[model samples]
Target: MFVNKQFNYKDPVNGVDIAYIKIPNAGQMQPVKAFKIHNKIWVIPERDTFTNPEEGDLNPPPEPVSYYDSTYLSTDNEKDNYLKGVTKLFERIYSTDLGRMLLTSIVRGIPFWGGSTIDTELKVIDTNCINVIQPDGSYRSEELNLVIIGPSADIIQFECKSFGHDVLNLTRNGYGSTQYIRFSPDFTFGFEESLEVDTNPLLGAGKFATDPAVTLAHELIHAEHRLYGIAINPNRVFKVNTNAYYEMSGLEVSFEELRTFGGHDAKFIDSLQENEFRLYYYNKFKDVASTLNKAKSIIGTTASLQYMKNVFKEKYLLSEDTSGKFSVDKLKFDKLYKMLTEIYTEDNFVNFFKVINRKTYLNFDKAVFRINIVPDENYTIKDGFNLKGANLSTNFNGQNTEINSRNFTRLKNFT
Candidate 1:
């Protein structure tokens, strides 16, 4: 039985014996006291010290002089650096004594995090501090892409960091790792960077801790709370008229949330708010219709319908009927419905509805209870966008649509 070589130690506080491991280049090693939960291995690094080189004799490496390192596409030297850096970071963080202790407590049925969610398949990468200058003279740091394989292998890149303070646009950490990939692939990423403790006696004085070990603990809690899903309850509601257009056609639309299949989850209507100018208008109609139906039962049908039309046309942007003989009830109401069915097919509505739903649900102002975008287990490799330097699979799925000028076709098509 090979346990893959553990760095055994005795706790100074409790005097308990434990086995640990350290990554190759981590600033420090943290002690973790346990094993996998439900087959998911929870990695915890021993320390989280944030530090930078001060007196190293070695001058920093030179920036890449070629396009090879500048673009999302990879080359030999770049790939080697990425693979080595990521492997080292993973080993160091997961092998820590602190990481182990947190995970072990999970098996005892005590959650070390807000929610007992495990984060695995962390694709770590090193930027090497070597800013690769692009043709346009823009500087870019190196990044890592994590791939999922099943029917075919598909890749998604992740930019990870250890600390939250002095946060750069490129640095981020923990949970909804996939959402970082999907939200906007072009944006730079950051993560909870792992730290390597300076425990070696020979060089102990020169090195202090980087990020505290608890930073990892805190970020893990955030990630778990997000991944496991939380409940949100809304107290008030407002009538709104919203609109949305097709990315290609730019045609505005209106409809009901439930009737238009707009809501992503019934228990979570506010979970995903599709804030379209057009859809909002349609929702207003549904609300009005519900109100009119209730009013009609008491106020005579004709008068109820007339009052509804006045509210929609006068108060809303709807056009009023010109002729006195013309039925106000059916003017804007009938026209929009007729136009919707005639101009848009059910399938088209479904597709367009989804886009509106996504935009509405993902509004930055909507206050998401939590975003969960689990990476697909079975991912497909993509090309034709020049992402793969010939046949390579870029872990990024969002690129195919954008770079290829295919725009959202990947989501609609199979091959």
Candidate 2:
């Protein structure tokens, strides 16, 4: 039951409409989504649990068949010794939140990361030889020189170091990145950049550098941009990032040819790269958010701010009179939230234990209040529509492009 039928069609079997939906700042989709009336509003329906297909069966009906074929990752291209490595790398990439998110966008009718819809090849190459096979089935690597810098790494190599670029696939009008990213056959090779000074065992400054997922995710973001025909390649390849992947549908090409990338342009790109870490951190540290949710759920804002302070203080006092349940979980939450904000690298896998492993002596001293985690999953780090609901709005009122804006990431405030 939709308020507007213009964007939907009936399912002859007398069920919900086959909906191709769009929310204000959120993504768009083809006619495979499910929705229902919620307090007079038409919204995409979700069920967190499952029940049998009996009376009032809320389980969504089976989806209609899709006509398009996906040209996703394949093992058919037997061109290199790295195929084994490539698949293993992709295995982690798809498991990640960023990887899953990007893939979801594409399936939902927004190829936000702009990858090829036709069969594309993925390969692993050595530093100097970044060979990518073209439509003619020939390999090409630039004779010109290129380099990637890691701050802590200082891991400079000349080969096809985990690369992604959309070259024209003249065979079909659609584009393909022919992403042949060559990294250490060793797989967990370190690309450590300058690590932060918080070298406590709580830090994974080096651990994240070796995770192939981050490497692949970063390059895939780059590949998507190139495929979209709006290359965001930074002059300094060392600092390229996935944070840039968040914005899609193309703008002014967000280019900065100086650092040698711009005052605002250069700074903005780097800033977005910096901002990108925070974004990734938020999503990357889901446990932090989950524990924070439970902590806030139990130790709510309903408790006075001063009382909250004492409860935490009581953890250190070991008064024995305090509630152990509240104090310990709250402490863990505090550590996680702080680390989530402070630990810049993706090594939270190591640092997650830091939050969990805190002994009784650890004291935050009301430091937890420095930042607040917005409760919604869709909330971007910070924005003009300032956050949350904008991504889910129907736009009763919004800007000029608001009514018809296609890029979900760009929508600010919607009416």
What is the alpha-carbon lDDT of model 1 when measured against the actual structure?
A: 0.24
* Cα lDDT of model 1 by residue, 134-191, tens digit: 3354543322111100000111211122211222111111111110111112111111
* Total backbone collisions, model 1: 58
Q: TM-score for candidate 2, please give it.
A: 0.25
Candidate with maximal TM-score: 2
Off by over 4 Å in 1: 1-73, 102-221, 230-415
**Per-candidate TM-score against the hidden true structure:** 0.19, 0.25
Over the stretch 2-89, how does candidate 2's per-residue lDDT look in tens digits?
Answer: 1223222122212333232222111232222222221111222221011111312323334511111111111222112222333333
In model 1, state the lDDT of residue 373: 13
True-structure RMSD for candidate 1: 27.6
